[PDB]
Prior knowledge:
3 chains, A: mainly beta, B: 298 residues, Elongation Factor Tu (Ef-tu), domain 3, 12-stranded antiparallel sheet, 1 helix
Amino acid sequence: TTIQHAPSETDPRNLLFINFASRNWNRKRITTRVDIKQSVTMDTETIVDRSAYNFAVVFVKN
Amino acid sequence: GVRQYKIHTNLDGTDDKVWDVTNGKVRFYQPSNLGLQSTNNIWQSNGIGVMGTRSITQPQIEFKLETFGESLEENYQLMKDFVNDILSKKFVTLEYQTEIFQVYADLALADVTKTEGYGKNGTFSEKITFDIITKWYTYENLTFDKIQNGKVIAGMSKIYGGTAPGNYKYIKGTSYTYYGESDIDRLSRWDIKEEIFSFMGILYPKLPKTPAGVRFLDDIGNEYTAIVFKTEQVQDYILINTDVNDETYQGWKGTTALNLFPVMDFERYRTRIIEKGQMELINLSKAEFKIKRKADFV
Amino acid sequence: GVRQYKIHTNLDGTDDKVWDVTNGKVRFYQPSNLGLQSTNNIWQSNGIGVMGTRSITQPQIEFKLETFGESLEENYQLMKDFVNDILSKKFVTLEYQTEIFQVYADLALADVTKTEGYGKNGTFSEKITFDIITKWYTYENLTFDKIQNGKVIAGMSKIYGGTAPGNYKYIKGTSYTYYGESDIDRLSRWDIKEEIFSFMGILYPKLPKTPAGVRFLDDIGNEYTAIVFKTEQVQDYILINTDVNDETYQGWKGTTALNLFPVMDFERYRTRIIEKGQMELINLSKAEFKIKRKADFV
Lengths: 62, 298, 298
Ligand SMILES: [Sr+2]
Ligand SMILES: [Sr+2]
């Protein structure tokens, strides 16, 4: 979120906008290295919700 | 020669009151610590040492406050006055002075003692402790620099001289170098050489209803911060102080003082910390600046 | 004979400034502790003792800062200089020298004191405390080793000599031993005998656009780490510093300094800690290395 004065010089209003833009219109992939000296914190996240018991004792009603 | 300790009520101010704690009736002696402490955030992995960021911490200065009165009446009046003067202002400026430097530190009253253990004619020997706001900064005058035209020399400067209809020769090294610029008197640089933390400026506006004040530029000519105000009438002068503790912005016209805070451009004023570059005067006829720049240890 | 303490603004660097705290105007005296505290994590069960891992902890060195100056002006100029010089650089390397060794410690200013208890001609007697980054390391020159061909001996070396069409005899013990190798000048070994923690190499590249730098091999001939760069033009030299605190990977061409970090191969550079083995030169014509290796107690 960014607060900035209206683009047109005639409009004297100060406005609030939401940003979904980048420094490059067609984003490029960067290749870099992270050293242990940078106080690195490693933790695992889950994007998609899928189940955790890999083995299933399935029962079928007679 | 020897060290001098002044105690100012409001330095940079018309209502300043100075106390000589080195020569006057109320004297400061034996400062506890004038140095500094630092926390470097050093974390070590497998014997190898990695260093973070140093937070320079300033410690409380405790002085052996002595009074030099002639009577019990004098010594009491000195304690009732000196201590209340420090209390009247939210913070007091201690000036450290020596043969080589004149630094200043903004103090706040931490602890003062009053006891009935008197010497002769009701003499006082007590301990006064102060809390550090900002330790060691240089309060100095800031002025613009003028550019002057170089002298005209035959054969060296670009001129059509000597035998008619004039002649200028291309030589190797000496060749033709421009003398100066037509009306070089327009060029004025307010140079910023070191990072300034706070300031106090007096600005004289030219045109009313035109944003008036100062903008700051970096080494590449880009604006990062600006103190600009759009008034209705021509103010005699605009008194601006960047000090965090007593921030002052005001427009003076005659004997009347006007608050300029709501009229100020809030988007242009991005930072208080001034970086290496230059200052430009927006709609100003004259400007007077007093710059205060920090030093950790002196 | 006697020991020598020397404070360095930037060791391994061109902008170095050295202060003799043993012989100069500003001296360090009576170090607090030069030893070490160890925590072994020992737990005893039913009289039997079990030992964990020893965390060798390094303690703050507190010196006795003392200036010797002809005038009050001189000693105030010494305190302002020595402290700012330590503050100007993020960390300062203290050199410890004796008849037997020349160790170094990376220090960060923890606390410095300034008081008004002056001796003769205004002489300071204060306490200067330092935080340990790395305690005791050896800064030495690392060079490659050359291999030379063994001498040719009749009967001992593999040659077809004497009576035509030559003869070499199989004896017991003396028999035939190869003299050397054709072009023995190709073999060069940058031997690493003890584990090193950081280094300052000056690499001179050969071919442009071909990855240039250094690679490190273990005792079995396997690569564990490699600092290599793929530049567009031939750099005059690539100045690399593996120090954690001020890591530098810059290329030099003429008087121009270029940062080579984004051009580097990030996959090959797995570790900073160099193990026992050898070092190879990738696309390099010449290389100059300075190796720093740690010692807990000296
Ligand atoms: Sr003030
Ligand atoms: Sr260095």
